[PDB]
Amino acid sequence: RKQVSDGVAHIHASFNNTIVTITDRQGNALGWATAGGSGFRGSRKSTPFAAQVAAERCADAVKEYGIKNLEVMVKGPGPGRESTIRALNAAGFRITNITDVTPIPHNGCRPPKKRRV
């Protein structure tokens, strides 16, 4: 319906899940898919493979604009940091730049207590 050809893959990779969002340079959301909503729950949801099909499913709800180049923004420590990026590149995508944007406070907010499991 419209045209971009130049995008950015923001991947949010937490421990429990990994959300993939495709966007233009402006930061406007073009398409998105998550692992948790691609048929993966709990123990399987938090896997690199689930992040992979997330990246794959996302490349199908965006090529309506015919993106052809993009940059990658890796946020968080979970799986699908890396495997998500791979799936994008195999789905027919030229990777321009890779950047980690995981936030690091300069020691500000006190985090939750340690879990005594």
Next chain:
RNA sequence: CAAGCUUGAGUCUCGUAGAGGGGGGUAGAAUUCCAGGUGUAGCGGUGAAAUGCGUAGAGAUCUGGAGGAAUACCGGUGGCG
């Protein structure tokens, strides 16, 4: 008890290092919140879940603003009291 003596103890001069104390300014990261743009069905959480949150449009992304609290890297059997 009286006179002393200069090594103990002080005083003087010029410098050095320091998270030593008290007051006042100020900074950039992040969280949460408020207001919007893009976007759409999930997010969140766990060993597994559910409670919880989201079509009154969340989460994700970009933008502007409010507020509080603490000061990554430096950073170290480093330093000061």
